[PDB]
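Response to reviewer comment R2.3. The reviewers asked that we include at least one raw input/output pair. We reproduce the pair for Importin subunit alpha-1 here without editing.
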Amino acid sequence: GTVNWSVEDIVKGINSNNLESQLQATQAARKLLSREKQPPIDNIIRAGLIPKFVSFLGKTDCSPIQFESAWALTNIASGTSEQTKAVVDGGAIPAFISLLASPHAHISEQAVWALGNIAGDGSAFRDLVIKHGAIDPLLALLAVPDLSTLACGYLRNLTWTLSNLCRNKNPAPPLDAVEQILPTLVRLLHHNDPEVLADSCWAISYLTDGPNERIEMVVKKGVVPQLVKLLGATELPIVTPALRAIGNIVTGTDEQTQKVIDAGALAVFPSLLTNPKTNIQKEATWTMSNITAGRQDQIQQVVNHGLVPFLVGVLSKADFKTQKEAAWAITNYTSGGTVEQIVYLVHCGIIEPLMNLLSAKDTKIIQVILDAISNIFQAAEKLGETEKLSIMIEECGGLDKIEALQRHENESVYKASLNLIEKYFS
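Raw output as returned:
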């Protein structure tokens, strides 16, 4: 009967000179801490029990107390940063790393879970877990010919912890550790379990969220085609991180963006740009905005795949944040695109939704839309057709909005709008 003990009784049991009494009290503590209704984590910490749990981690001759104390410590380390810090300050990191090699799979799984929580807290604890030498034994746990012979939950916990070692910025994980972990992530990215795939995609999205050198580390391993395939998954928990990784990658150079395009990503965007999940739509439109900031042949790839009508659609009706990403996409398209491509954009109906967005209460989207209008007018000048575009803008109500913006609080707004009026509506 280790259910519902008081903290005083747990302390009495853990301070007894009786390994079995200590074990029973430790299990009682684990059960307290694993209740979803406000676990008394802080009371356990104040009782001074973390050092006792950490010392129990080292009793190889009593694996049950190793297991129970590991689980109690894991439940503490899954809370606030101060509670994770309490666990770390007790010396738990090297003890859990030593337990990674346990012959009891449940104990090593508990150690994997604990190190995942600790490393997930933040950059400093992540780098400290790495310094204590966790990566080698972690990856050795996965050194089997077929991942499918491992228990499902075990492999899932390993993948989650590895993703947490790839997580957080300022600073990003050490390049050495990233290189050490990447091959295993590449293997996990091909494993048939939705949760393993989701967490591998999350790890990749963490590693690609940075300068082009990190992106390049990831892209050199050849994972972009697999990322696109997973972009096409039906499980939203897979699509979300896969799309995040692809967007990150296209924030890089034009060659990395081209690697995304060559893998077939664009063919998936009709659905992504109409996805019923608002965040999928927003991230797909952000990815598109970065693609249309590339070379003219990449804008042309966007055109060939019939995605300009979907950007018109998103601009016309979507969550306002998605519409802002779409305005960005249009401004980049018009800034980098050929005359023919801007003409095509107009022929797809961009002008009316573009104008309708000028009544928004957001200054940045107004600046972006005015930049797009100026670029389109530049193309029209190059074609000597500013009157046609002026009439088009005037017929859908854009001229009223621009003349109203001429008197806007922001300096840039009234400047750009006055320029447009004087230049093409006089």
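Residues 1-426 form a domain with the Leucine-rich Repeat Variant fold (CATH 1.25.10.10). The chain has one domain: 1-426. Further pairs are available on request from the corresponding author.
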